[PDB]
Amino acid sequence: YSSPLRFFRNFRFHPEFTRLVAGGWRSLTYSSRIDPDKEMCPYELEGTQCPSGCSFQHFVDITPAA
C-alpha cells in the first residue's frame, strides 16, 4: 500500500517516517530548501564543469537544514 500523501510535507511527521524513508529528515525528497523557480545545473547533471559564476541551482544548495 502506498499513501497518496506520502510525498507531501506532512508525511515528515508520520510516526513511521524514519522507518519508511531511507534518508529520514536529511532526505532530499522532503527538503524545504529547493527553489522551485531555479533550474538545476545541467553541467552538474551531465558530468561537466560549471562555468565560472554558474547561477543554476546545485545539489549542495538544496541539502536539508535540520
Binding site: 531511507a22 547533471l45 545539489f59
Partner: protein, 211 residues
C-alpha cells in the same frame, strides 16, 4: 473473516474516492496553471492507469474545440494540454501531436516495460487530467536565449538522460510540490480532504488484513 474483508475494502474505496477528489483539485487550472512551467517535471499517469513516470514539461496550451464540436463538454482538467517529454517504449508508434476531442494522450504509445529496452524520448501531448504530480525540480530546456530545440532527437536524448540522472540522485523519490506549502492551495475543504485521508489510512493499517 468475511465481514472483515468487507470493512477493509470499504476503507480502501473511501480512500480511493477522496484521492480522486484531491487529485482533481490539484489538477484544476485555477490551482496549477501558475506551476506548469517549461522544465518542471511532471508525473504523467493516464485515465486507464498507465504510468508514464516522470517527464519534462516543454509547453502548455488551452485545448481548442473542433470545428464539429464547439461545446465538447470538457472538464477544466481536460481543457488544457501539456506537452511533456516522456520516455516511450521502443515499439511505440509515431506520436500524433494533435489530440482528438475524446483523448487524454495519443494512441499507440506506452512507457518502457521490458527491462532491456532503453526507450525513446518524445514530446507527448497530455491533458491536465494526466498530471499526478509536479516536482519542485526544473531542468534546463532549450529556450532561444540558447539554441537547440526538442525537435532535435539528440537534445531530447540529452534532456531525458539528465532526467534519469536527477532521479538517481533523489534516492527516496523526485520531490513533489506540496499542494499547500508549494502550490498555496488554501481551501478549507481541501485541508479537510487531506485530514480525512489520513484518518482512514490510520484505520486501514490497523486492520489485520493490511500487509
Amino acid at each position: 473473516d468475511e465481514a472483515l474483508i468487507k470493512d477493509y475494502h470499504s476503507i480502501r474505496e473511501q480512500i480511493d474516492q477522496y484521492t480522486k477528489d484531491m487529485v482533481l483539485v490539484m489538477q484544476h487550472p485555477t490551482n496549477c496553471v501558475k506551476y506548469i512551467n517549461p522544465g518542471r517535471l511532471m508525473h504523467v499517469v493516464t485515465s486507464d492507469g498507465t504510468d508514464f513516470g516522470w517527464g519534462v514539461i516543454i509547453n502548455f496550451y488551452e485545448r481548442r474545440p473542433e470545428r464539429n464540436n464547439p461545446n465538447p463538454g470538457w472538464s477544466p482538467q481536460e481543457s488544457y494540454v501539456v506537452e511533456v517529454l516522456l520516455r516511450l517504449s521502443s515499439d511505440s508508434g509515431s506520436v500524433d501531436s494533435k489530440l482528438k476531442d475524446n483523448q487524454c494522450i495519443p494512441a499507440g504509445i506506452a512507457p518502457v516495460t521490458q527491462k532491456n529496452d532503453p526507450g525513446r524520448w518524445e514530446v507527448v501531448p497530455c491533458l491536465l487530467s494526466c498530471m499526478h504530480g509536479l516536482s519542485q525540480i526544473k531542468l534546463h530546456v532549450p529556450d532561444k536565449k540558447s539554441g537547440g530545440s526538442m525537435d532535435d532527437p539528440e537534445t531530447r536524448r540529452r534532456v531525458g538522460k539528465s532526467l534519469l540522472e536527477v532521479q538517481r540522485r533523489f534516492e527516496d523519490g523526485i520531490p513533489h510540490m506540496d499542494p499547500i506549502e508549494n502550490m498555496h492551495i488554501r481551501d478549507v475543504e481541501f485541508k479537510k480532504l487531506l485530514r480525512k485521508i489520513e484518518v482512514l489510512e490510520s484505520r486501514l493499517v490497523a486492520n489485520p488484513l493490511h500487509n
